[PDB]
């Protein structure tokens, strides 16, 4: 029962076309603003605010409670991106571009310190461990027909 003129069309340029488009999407003409008229193909569809579904009021009596949407209302172009199982735009206690500095600084500091500690390792004041039979030459792969160089250990 959705007739032909209830479907999205081309970009509106005349004020009467904009009024008709705003009425078609159940919006105020003062609120309805389409996407810029490039060749991206948005056409008549309104450019709703880029808020997520998580930011909507959870105490309202929505027609679809999980979706947080009302029947017949214009749906954001990127609804499936903002379904709140996904990308969230909700305001954070700490400003964006402030969390980024802290996170990047922490990771960079830890990486630089790990590299420094690799340059300056920790060890005990001991000599290398000593093994009896030419450093176990026959044990570590064998080849018992090539007379390994004598690895000789002395007591101290």
């Amino acid at each position: 029962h959705v007739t032909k003129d209830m479907f999205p069309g081309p970009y509106p340029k005349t004020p009467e076309e904009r009024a008709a488009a705003a009425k078609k999407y159940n919006m105020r003409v003062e609120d309805y603003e389409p996407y810029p008229d490039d060749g991206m193909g948005y056409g008549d569809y309104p450019k709703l605010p880029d808020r997520s579904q998580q930011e909507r009021d959870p105490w309202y009596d929505w027609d679809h409670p999980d979706l947080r949407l009302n029947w017949g209302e214009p749906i954001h172009w990127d609804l499936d991106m903002y379904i709140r199982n996904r990308v969230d735009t909700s305001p954070t206690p700490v400003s964006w571009n402030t969390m980024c500095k802290h996170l990047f600084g922490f990771v960079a500091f830890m990486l630089f310190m790990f590299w420094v500690g690799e340059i300056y390792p920790s060890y005990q004041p001991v000599g290398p461990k000593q093994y009896p039979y030419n450093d176990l030459y026959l044990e570590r792969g064998g080849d018992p027909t090539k007379e390994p160089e004598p690895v000789v250990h002395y007591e101290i």
Binding site: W59, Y60, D61, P93, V94
Partner: protein, 178 residues
């Protein structure tokens, strides 16, 4: 949740909501009951300091400054009730909620069990079918020609009338349906 929202919030409503949010976040910060009570009375005093202001502009500026202070000093992990929209048990029992119209698709052998319940359900269905037309007529009568202005619904006004659009409000599955 149960009340139809208004077109906008008054300054008084915003002030009370900010008061409640500040109190809850202060309780989140002040874990213990005595310290929370002390700082809550301090908050109440600071809040009553500007109780009787008559200049709306300065009251609005005070509200904006208070909101900025709350946002800067809010708890990053405020306490949330388990069933609240942020709680750990918010939508836990939603998978147990089955709509009542599913009972019509039951096999007759399934309805052989529970006979009295289904007889009473038949009574309820007759009631709804016999009230629907009067509900629609009342809604048409009590509505301005330019459509409804708010989401409020009128009550019943006649002898044997039921409030319009009542079936899906009365027949909620449950809060703990299983």
């Amino acid at each position: 949740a149960f009340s139809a929202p208004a077109a906008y919030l008054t300054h008084q409503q915003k002030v009370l909501r900010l008061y409640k949010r500040a109190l809850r976040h202060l309780e989140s910060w002040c874990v213990h009951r005595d310290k929370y009570r002390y700082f809550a009375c301090l908050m109440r005093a600071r809040f009553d300091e500007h109780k009787n202001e008559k200049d709306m502009v300065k009251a609005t500026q005070l509200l904006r400054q208070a909101e900025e202070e709350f946002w800067y000093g809010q708890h990053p992990q405020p306490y949330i009730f388990p069933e609240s929209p942020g709680g750990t048990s918010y939508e836990r029992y939603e998978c147990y909620k089955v709509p009542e119209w599913c009972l019509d698709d039951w096999h007759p052998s399934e309805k052989a069990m529970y006979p009295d319940y289904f007889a009473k359900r038949e009574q309820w269905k007759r009631l709804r079918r016999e009230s629907w037309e009067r509900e629609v007529k009342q809604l048409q009568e009590e509505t301005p020609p330019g459509g409804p202005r708010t989401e409020a619904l009128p009550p019943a006004r006649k002898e044997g009338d039921l409030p319009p659009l009542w079936w899906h409000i009365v027949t909620r599955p449950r809060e703990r349906p299983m």
